[PDB]
Every structure is written in structure tokens, then in C-alpha cells.
Design an enzyme around this catalytic site. Structure first.
Site, PDB file in Angstrom:
ATOM      1  N   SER A 168      13.560  -7.939  54.251  1.00  0.00           N
ATOM      2  CA  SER A 168      12.427  -7.914  53.104  1.00  0.00           C
ATOM      3  C   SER A 168      11.591  -8.586  53.888  1.00  0.00           C
ATOM      4  O   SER A 168      12.399  -9.422  55.305  1.00  0.00           O
ATOM      5  CB  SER A 168      12.591  -8.766  51.787  1.00  0.00           C
ATOM      6  N   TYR A 186      14.936 -16.617  51.748  1.00  0.00           N
ATOM      7  CA  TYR A 186      14.636 -15.409  52.631  1.00  0.00           C
ATOM      8  C   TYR A 186      15.805 -15.065  54.274  1.00  0.00           C
ATOM      9  O   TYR A 186      16.235 -14.154  54.474  1.00  0.00           O
ATOM     10  CB  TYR A 186      13.680 -14.925  52.176  1.00  0.00           C
TER      11      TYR A 186
END
Lengths: 242, 242, 242, 242
Positions: free
Chosen positions: D146, D157
Site C-alpha cells: 500500500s 505496514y
């Protein structure tokens, strides 16, 4: 005389192999050491051998790296015992690796379990330790992936190793202002009977295969004050295996 | 007792800065040291300080790293003095640095001169040293780039540093079978008065700026027997400055 | 209809191999192309083939990448011919390669010559091209290292390739504010008859060996408008050979 | 005319942002596309818009990336529809990222959940797709993390992004002999109102911020035949943000 004189350290996965050798090495360098591992008995015994009959500078603590509450309780018991903290050494199992097959046959549950223990465990331990490191005036966290045709198999171990390196950089970035260093060690082929593996010799650049003492010496260096300007780094200890 | 007992080392660029502090550190760790630099008097004076009035464990040699013949004479006089070789430390100036302007104004002659000295000098030194290292039973070459606005300027210096890292890997690969390790150290901002540079402290992760002793400690670790399973590696000593 | 419609490109090393195939590809994608190489006749002949008997969209210019003055004249004659500049493709020999022996036997003059041509040539070309790229509203520089036993030999070539990558980052950083992108392509084993090299196929991940068209396609992508958010990057085109 | 003419592709996370723009781009390049996402309705609607009133070249499939059985069912339905497979594009949420706080306050459950969806999901999808890619005579898998002071927050992340890169290398290594390529794309700041973010402009090297079309163009390139000699690579699409 000890290169870690007066330091307080936690070592997880300390019941055997790299963890055990490192735990004995830090204590021989003058560190007080909390040894932590799933195997309660194996870690009490090693703690007892390090203490000798006169010593008080090691303790064995039972921990489940997949259980955040167990990981938090371990860090508290170590701080309770020695009154502070300078070093956290997060350490990453034959059948365990036997289950980590190539992607084509990989089991998603083994991936989930691998990330939980190797990454989430180190993260929680680090998070629990950070305020104690900071109150000490600084200190360091050292992340060691497990020992490594390595891309040809064990992909979940490879993935968690890379994630651990990212955790290392996250922590170094986030805790640096508060005087905490964070570095990773990435061991190659570490022999914990060296003769049965000599087929691997031409694939190394060194003239010998790895020993757990190679990782321990790297941990002593990165934990010592004379490495205090090193952070966010990954030291590869692999005799050139690449 | 010293961590480098009985070892023989060459240190180039040893008249000042990092080379000078490192040379003193290796001798303090029990190594016999040949100090080499362009500045003849400066290197004998420091060899004389290390030696003391009655000592013999350091010598100063005049070398021009740009001239292959001068570099080869220096390696031979070092071996001739101490009878062998265990460690070669290739060390890569304010004016020279002021000449290394951004690409838009860069002078090709500065680039040429920079590669000749920082790269070819280290290659020739390494070339000259290798059979002595091999005959000794193995040993190590440690390449130290010069200390680091980052990519915004000194592009010839950054080019030569990347080239030096490639040389380090070339040598570790080619000489590893014969027992030679080769590693690099990449220093960040090293202060050889900390006050004038305080503005740089938020750019660092660590709470202090770098010292030549930080690079010297990394050289002692990498030159030592307990680091013998490490080769082909770059150790960044930069307090996180990236 | 072409992916590089209305653009103006310089391609150095364009008489043969990768440079030649790339130059033909850019013109086929609708670019006007200045072909530059040491080999004057070879570059006019290819410019003439691309042009056709009645075309004007390609020119061949004689350049010596080792001489800064020759490189600057070439950039100026390219801009003078086509009225602007959008793309500079710096392209880095069997004999020259046979001279690039392992470090033990390496000749410093070969290293010097290699940096002059592969590195300083690209820097000077880039330097000369930058204000034309900026005045055009932005554009891009693409640096292509020469095609790759790996680290076991050609160490001067590997050194200069790492240096070229550093130059690429230096330029992307310094010129990005003015709209210039700079990227590198690192080709692996490129065959400019596949049969004689079949032994190399198990060393690759892919089931075929490389072709100059593989590098040309990467250059078209990186030179195009839909790649304008990519800069400072190295694209390895090596079929996984590593 | 289409650069992906006759190709069959799966795109996960296709209901919005990068996934949606990519899914439309592959179809505009002539690919038949199975769009897959948690949001059943959002993916049916987009599929319907791509089809128009005449077309049959897109379908919407409901999938839960955290559920291996759902991921396997999705790959089968796509193969069932179009009769084969050439491309798998694994795509990695405001509150989701709001929950990904710095290590000091990190929630181990959010880490576990993040690895399950972003890493275990891509792994299972890849594993399900591999035999279909291989039977096709080869094809490719493209992993996109992402969109990204990035190390200062969102550490889970960051960790899963690094793990995904390792998965990419594992798959390229393991599937290469069978003609499958695997590459990753690592987007920087991608704006899916560009004016509210212009504070970030001086931290980029480009003169604009990222667009989802920048990632889509990279996916078209890496999926196309003219990139068939590229595997195991990570293309960073970040305008120099680093």
C-alpha cells in the site's frame, strides 16, 4: 575488564543454541542477564550454571513469545530482579523449519504462527522494554533472526526475517531521540557437528562454517558502549554465503 | 589482553583524523602498526608517539596512494619491518572536499583524481597485501570510505564510496577461499568541537555526533578473530543519519 | 501512437549492441534521436538506416566519452539539430573486458581508464544535458551500466557500475526540483546466438537469456511520461541471475 | 494495439484507489480482468462499467484476503470465467492505518491482522494461481504494497511491506524455472485532492505528487511481454521520497 561491565541484559530464546551461547557470553563480559525461553527448566539450569555457587548475576524466566501478556510479565520480572535494563536481545525448531515448505505447498497457518512468534514477539518485548531503556539514560535492542539455496525454501522464515529488519529500523527511528539504539544481526549457516555440513564449504567465502560464538561476539560488540554510534543497521554474519 | 595481540596492521591515511586515531587504537590493542600517509613527518611523529622513546611496535612510512609504485613500496617496507601482515586498513581534505561540487558545476579532473586516490589506491594496496595475508594463514582488509547535506553534494566522493563497497565485495569473493576477509565501514558525520555542529543533532537518530573513536572501535571489531565469520559486509557508523 | 511521440533523445554508445537496438527502438517509438559513439562511420550508417533515404529524425555524431570537450560538443550538436532535448541515455568491449582481470592481477591503468569512460563520461554528458532538459520543462537521464561469473571477475567494471548508480542518485536528488528524473538500468547477461550460452540457463530464474531488446524496452518505459513519478531508481534486467 | 492483448489478469483490492485504476487500465490495454475485493457491490459496479453494454471482459468477485478458502475460491472463479490466467496483481483503509501507531503504543493484534491480510493473503493467492500460470506456459505475479516521516509511524505496514518483498523474491526463485516472473511495486505517496498535500512537495524529488495511474502504468509494464526478462525486482514508484 568485561566489555559489558555493569550492564543489565535480557536474552530471549536463551535455553539453547545461539541464545544460550550469547547469554553465557554477555555474563562472562560482566552483564547481569535474564535468560528467557519457553523451556523453563532449560533456562533455570543454564542460569544456575552461569551463577555458579557464589553468583547472583543470572536468572531464568519462563516466557511464551506468542503471548503478549507473558512477554510483558517477563520484562517486568527481569527489571524487578536487577533494578533496570540496558540491553534487550530478541532471539528468533527442526520440525518448525520442516513445516516451512516452499510457497507451492505452504500452510497459511504456519505463516501466521511464524509472524506471531518471530515478529509480534520481538515487537511486544521491545515495546515493554523501551521505557526501562529510556529511564536508564539509553541502551539498545538487538534483533537476531534465526540461522539461514535459502530462497529455495523456508519462505515464511525469510519473510519474518525481512519484517524483523523493518521493525529494527522502525524502533531505531522512533526511539533514537530518547537514546535507544536498535540493530539487527542476520546469521547465515550456524552449526550448533561441523563435519556433516562440509558440503556447504565451497558456497561460503570463509574457510569454516559458522558457530554460535560468531553471533554472540557480534551481540557483545553491538551492545557495548563503543558501538553507541551504530543504529538501524543489519550486521550479516554469514561467512559470505549471501 | 589486547584484543589484537600479536597482529600486524597497515593503516593508510594515518597522519590525521580517523586514520591517526585508529592507528593508535590498534597499537593499544596490541597490534604492531605501519602508519602510512602522504605527510611523511606527520606520520613519523605519530609513529614516534605510539612507540615511545624505547618502543618498536610502530613505524611511519611515506606513501602516495595515487602512485601504484609508491603503494607497493609501502606494503613491502611494512612487511619487511614486522615480518608479516594480518590487517590492511585502507583509509580514504576540506579543500579537496570543497572542490567536490554538485554535478552541475563538477570538474571531471576532480572526479578522475578522486577515483585514482580513493579507489585505485585501495585496490593496489589490497593487491600488494593479499599474498602476505594469504601466507600468514588468512587475515583481513578493511576499507573505510571518507566521512559524509548527503546526496545534495560531494557526488565524486559518494561515487567513489559506492565503488569502494563494490571493491570490498570483489575482494571478499575472490580471496575468501584463501582465508582473507574484506569488509567496509561507512562513517557518517564524524567530528575529528561538537558545538559548531549542534544543528545536525536532530538529523541524527542518536543523541550525540560521531567521533573518530567510533570508527576505530568498528575497525578493532572487524579486524579481530571473533569477527572472522564476517566478510563482504558494510558496517554503517552514522548514528542513523542515513 | 508511438510511446515517445515528439521527444528528442541522445543515446551514447549507439553504434552497436544495446545502444544500437535502443536507438532504433526510440525512433520507432517516435523519438528524434542523436546517435553518439566513438565509431563515427558506424553511427552515421545506423542513423542513415533509421532515417531512411528521405527521413530526418536521426543523426549520428562522433564522440569520445573519455574527453570532456568532445562530450560537450556532442550534446550541443544534438540540441542544435533537433532544437531541444527530452532524454539522455548514457550507455557504457570484449578486449576491454578481457583486460578487467581479478584484483590479484588487476592493472590500475585499466581501472583509471574504466572510470574515465564509464563514469566521468556519463557525468559530463549529464552535466552538459541538464540545462537543456530543465529548459524543456523537465526530462530524464537514463544510465545503463555494461552487461554482467559475477563478482569473481571484472571488478573495475563492477566498481564503475556501483559508481554509476551513485551518480544516478546524486543527479535525481540535485535536479529533481527542476523537473529532471534520473534512473539506472542494470542489465545482466545480455546476448547481442543463444546456443553457446545455454550452460548459463540454470543460473537464471527465467527460462531464456537476455536480449538487447529487453534493455531497450526498459529504456522506453523509463523515458516515457507514464513513468514520470519514478526517479533515483535502479531497474535490474537480469532474468533473476542476481 | 493493447499492450496486454489476449492476457487474463486478476486484480485484488480492485474496488477502489490503486486497484480500481489498475483494473481499468489493464482492461483498456486489452486484458480480460477479474476484479476482486471485500466490497462485492463496488467491484460488480466497476466490472459492469468496464464491460459497457457490449463487453464480457471483466467480472467482479467477492473475496476476503484474510480467508484462505475465500482466496482459493476467487482464483478458481476467475479461471473458470476466462479459461486461464496470465497475471496475478496482489493489492494491499484510513482507520486501518489510524490503528497502526508507533511501536511504543502498537497493538499486537493489529500487527497479526496486518500480516494475515497483506502477507498471508498474497501468499495464498499466489499459491492458488501458480499452477494456472505454469499451465499457461508462464506468466507473472505483481505484488503492490500500500502507499507510504514514514518510518516515524505505521510500523506494521512497513514490516508487512518488507515481508511482501521477501515473498516476491521467494516466488521468483521458486517459480522461475517454470516460467513465472514475480516482481513488487512499492508506491510512495499516492494521492487518490492533490492541493491539500502540497506541504509534501519539497520532500519529493519530482515536481508533483503521486497518482494511482503511476502505479497502474508500472503494473502494465511489469505485466507485459517486453518485461519478461525482469523478475525478483522491486520497482519503487515514489517521486524520490525515499
Amino acid at each position: 575488564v568485561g566489555r559489558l561491565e555493569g550492564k543489565i541484559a535480557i536474552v530471549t530464546g536463551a535455553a539453547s543454541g545461539i541464545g544460550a551461547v550469547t547469554a553465557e557470553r554477555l555474563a562472562a563480559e560482566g552483564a547481569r542477564v535474564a535468560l528467557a525461553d519457553l523451556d523453563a527448566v532449560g533456562v533455570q539450569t543454564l542460569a544456575e550454571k552461569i551463577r555458579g555457587a557464589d553468583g547472583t548475576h543470572a536468572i531464568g524466566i519462563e516466557v511464551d513469545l506468542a503471548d503478549p501478556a507473558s512477554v510483558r510479565a517477563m520484562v517486568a520480572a527481569a527489571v524487578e530482579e536487577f533494578g533496570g535494563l540496558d540491553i534487550l536481545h530478541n532471539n528468533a525448531t527442526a520440525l518448525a523449519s520442516s513445516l516451512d515448505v516452499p510457497v507451492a505447498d505452504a500452510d497459511p497457518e504456519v505463516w501466521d504462527r511464524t509472524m506471531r512468534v518471530n515478529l509480534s514477539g520481538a515487537m511486544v518485548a521491545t515495546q515493554a522494554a523501551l521505557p526501562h531503556l529510556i529511564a536508564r539514560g539509553g541502551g539498545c535492542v538487538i534483533n537476531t533472526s534465526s540461522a539461514a539455496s535459502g530462497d529455495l525454501s523456508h519462505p515464511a522464515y525469510a519473510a519474518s526475517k525481512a519484517a524483523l529488519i523493518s521493525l529494527t529500523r522502525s524502533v531505531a527511528t522512533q526511539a533514537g531521540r530518547s537514546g535507544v539504539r536498535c540493530n539487527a544481526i542476520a546469521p547465515g549457516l550456524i552449526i550448533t557437528r561441523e563435519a556433516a555440513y562440509r558440503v556447504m564449504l565451497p558456497h561460503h567465502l570463509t574457510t569454516r562454517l559458522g558457530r554460535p560464538e560468531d553471533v554472540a561476539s557480534a551481540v557483545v560488540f553491538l551492545a557495548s558502549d563503543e558501538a553507541s554510534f551504530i543504529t538501524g543497521q543489519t550486521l550479516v554474519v554469514d561467512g559470505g554465503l549471501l
